[PDB]
Amino acid sequence: SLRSDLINALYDEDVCGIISAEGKIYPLGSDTKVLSTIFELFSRPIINKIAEKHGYIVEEPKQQNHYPDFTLYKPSEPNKKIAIDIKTTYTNIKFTLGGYTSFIRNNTKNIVYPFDQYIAHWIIGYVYTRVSLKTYNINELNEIPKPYKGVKVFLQDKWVIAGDLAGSGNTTNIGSIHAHYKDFVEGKGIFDSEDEFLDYWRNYERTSQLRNDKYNNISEYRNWIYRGR
Amino acid sequence: SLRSDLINALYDENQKYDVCGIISAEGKIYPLGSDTKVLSTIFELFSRPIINKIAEKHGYIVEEPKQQNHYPDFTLYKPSEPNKKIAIDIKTTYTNKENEKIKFTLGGYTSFIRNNTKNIVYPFDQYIAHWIIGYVYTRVKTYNINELNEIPKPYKGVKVFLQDKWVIAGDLAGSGNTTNIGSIHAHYKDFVEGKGIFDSEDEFLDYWRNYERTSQLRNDKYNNISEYRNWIYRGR
DNA sequence: AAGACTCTT
DNA sequence: AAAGACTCTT
Ligand SMILES: [Ca+2]
Ligand SMILES: [Ca+2]
């Protein structure tokens, strides 16, 4: 299927620098700010080839602070849009998975298409293991030092891997499970369903203070449902 | 000087080169996206070699942050005068049509400027200058090396300038939740020429160290340079 | 857990 | 505008 083909293509598909039209190659930085944008760029060709093969249109956002990186859909079936978004983090694991106060609480905030038009939200997660100030020429490619000791990727539904603790404070992001690479691949989350994942993050309080009288984790949210919300 | 050479070297490479993609040691090339999250990354990678060449040329050592949320991108200093360090940070913004007014976000106003060692590679006091290399670009399949000349670039124009942070600093925040200083809202010439609003680096520093986080909080203190001057006039 | 590191209306 | 969207480190 689209999903299994994409997953296979992803595993199938070593970036070592940026290159100018003139043939000069500048090496990469060793931080996630750098790598996150590289991985995103490295993935576009793949997503588009596969979608192409399955009859879907791929679409990127116009406004820069919009979810998701790639919106896929058939023109005959438009209300069955798939959302794919790249997330990166490093090892020497857990991800940040987006805001919990935007499109999940408000159908049209910072989202390319209204949230109810997406039937799936896949996360493509890259994990790289943390390990030059000169420029190179096309032929010194094998002398340029890579800024990572290795890389692993996976595709998985956002709900399956979401955790119950916030991923960021002032930028109110959902944190994912804090698990080994395998657990993410297999999909061993904590939410019993996507409906539970949504309800939980649509009612999560922004800070410890207000959270203290509601719920701060999964056991407590469940105890909050029993009490009658 | 270093300042003059750096500007020359930056302005130079910028015109002589157009970055077009990322490349794999196996020779495959991937195109770039036309967003700032992408361009800011490119521009700092594209500047590292130039800053490092010009730096070595003047006996300066160069250090980059070890931790990911530290300023500045580049700390420059001669081992003979480590108490007169230079901080250079790369800022990027875009424009949809050449000649329009632009603005940059210039960093936090609650970190290193308020706490001598919060999120900075070296204590704020060991830095004698804070330079901003600002890049402005006009927004606009895999390839093999023999096609470099054909990959479409994700921008039509790229201008660069080097200027002191205090000189281009404005009086309105650049971001809310992430509490950034916002630059002047002006044309690129004003950034190069240095036509700011502050009179000294001391005033820039005092204004931003007393800027309140929210409008409600500021409404009673000061919300712009004028009110801040009156504020100062009356005894704070 | 909270707060560090450009865009949009 | 002011406020709030878009991985890391105590
Ligand atoms: Ca994204
Ligand atoms: Ca920086």
Residue A151 has, within 13 A of its CA and on its CB side, a CA count of: 23
Report CA(A222)–C1'(C3) in Å, whole number. Answer: 29
Going A125 to A130 to A135 to A140, the CA torsion angle's sign is negative
Going B28 to A5 to A189 to A158, the CA torsion angle's sign is positive
Report CA(A229)–C1'(C6) in Å, whole number. Answer: 38
Coil, strand, or helix at residue B21?
strand
Q: Do A20 and B20 touch (CB under 8 A)?
A: yes
Residue B148: which of A19, A40, A60 has the nearest Cβ?
A19
DSSP for B193-226, written as a single string? HT--S-SSHHHHHHHHHS--SSHHHHTTS-SSHH
Interface residues of chain B, partner chain A, Cβ below 8 Å:
16-27, 29-33, 35-38, 41-42, 44-46, 48-49, 52, 62, 68, 141-142, 145, 148-149, 151, 153, 177-178
The dihedrals phi and psi of B184, each to the nearest 5 degrees, come to: -70, 155
Going A37 to A39 to A44 to A47, the CA torsion angle's sign is negative
Q: Which helix (H) or strand (E) holds B76?
A: strand B74-78
**Side chain identity, residue A90:** Y
Q: Does any strand D atom come closer than 7 Å to the Cβ of B55? A: no
> Helices B2-16 and B36-57 meet at what angle, rounded to 10?
130
Protein residue at shortest CA distance from C1' of D9: B69
Q: Which helix (H) or strand (E) holds B95?
A: strand B81-95
Chain position carrying tokens 């499109």 = A103
Chain position carrying tokens 């340079």 = B225
Both tokens of B33, joined, read: 């996206």
Residues A34 and A56: their CA atoms lie apart, in Å, by: 30
Residue B20: which of A19, A135, A171 has the nearest Cβ?
A19
Q: How was this structure determined?
A: X-ray
Of B45, B44, B50, nearest to B16 (Cα)?
B50
**Side chain identity, residue B118:** K
Both tokens of A117, joined, read: 């038009």
Q: Which residues of A6-33 are buried (b: 16+ CB within 10 A; e: fewer)?
A: bbebbeeeebbbbbbeeebbbbbbbbbe
Report CA(B117)–C1'(D1) in Å, whole number. Answer: 31
Of A228, A93, A72, nearest to A167 (Cα)?
A93
Contact between A64 and A101 under an 8 Å Cβ cutoff? The reply is no
Question: What does each C-alpha distance from B18 to A134, A139, B14, B157 come to in angstroms?
Answer: 17, 19, 7, 10
Q: Does any strand D atom come closer than 7 Å to the Cβ of A158? A: no
Work out the end-to-end distance of chain B between its first and last CA atoms, rounded to an integer number of angstroms.
Answer: 40
- DSSP 8-class letter at A180: -
Residues A163 and A201: their CA atoms lie apart, in Å, by: 10
Chain position carrying tokens 């281009």 = B168
Going A208 to A191 to A93 to A110, the CA torsion angle's sign is negative
Q: Which helix (H) or strand (E) holds A86?
A: strand A81-91
Contact between B131 and B86 under an 8 Å Cβ cutoff? The reply is yes
Structural domains of chain A in order of their starting residue, each with its CATH number: 1-229 (3.40.600.10)
Both tokens of B221, joined, read: 């203190």
Report CA(A191)–C1'(C2) in Å, whole number. Answer: 25
- Which residues does residue B127 pair with via DSSP β-bridges, in sequence order? B85
Residues of A with catalytic annotation?
A: 69, 85, 87
| Candidates B14, B17, B56, B95, partner chain A, best to mutate (most A CBs within 10 A) | B17
Chain position carrying tokens 């006091």 = B125
Coil, strand, or helix at residue B14?
helix
Tell me, rounded to whole angstroms, the distance of Cα A41 from its chain centroid. Answer: 14
Residue A170: which of B26, B35, B178 has the nearest Cβ?
B178
Residues of B in contact with A139 (CB under 8 A): none
Residues B174 and A88: their CA atoms lie apart, in Å, by: 26
Q: Find the A67 Cα to ligand 1 centroid distance in Å.
A: 6
Resolution in A: 2.0
Q: Does any strand D atom come closer than 7 Å to the Cβ of A43? A: no
Kindly provide the residue ranges of all beta strands, DSSP E only, lying in B143-189, ordered along the sequence: 143-144, 155-164, 169-175, 180-183
Q: Do A41 and B26 touch (CB under 8 A)?
A: no
Instruction: Name B144's Cβ contacts closer than 8 Å, sequence gap at least 6.
Output: B27, B28, B29
Residues B27 and A142: their CA atoms lie apart, in Å, by: 10
Contact between A78 and A116 under an 8 Å Cβ cutoff? The reply is no
The dihedrals phi and psi of A150, each to the nearest 5 degrees, come to: 175, 175
- DSSP 8-class letter at A171: T
Q: Is residue A158 classed exposed, middle or buried when 0-12, 13-18 and 19+ CB atoms within 10 A define those classes?
A: buried
Tell me, rounded to whole angstroms, the distance of Cα B58 from its chain centroid. Answer: 22
Give B124 to chain A, closest Cα distance, Å: 23
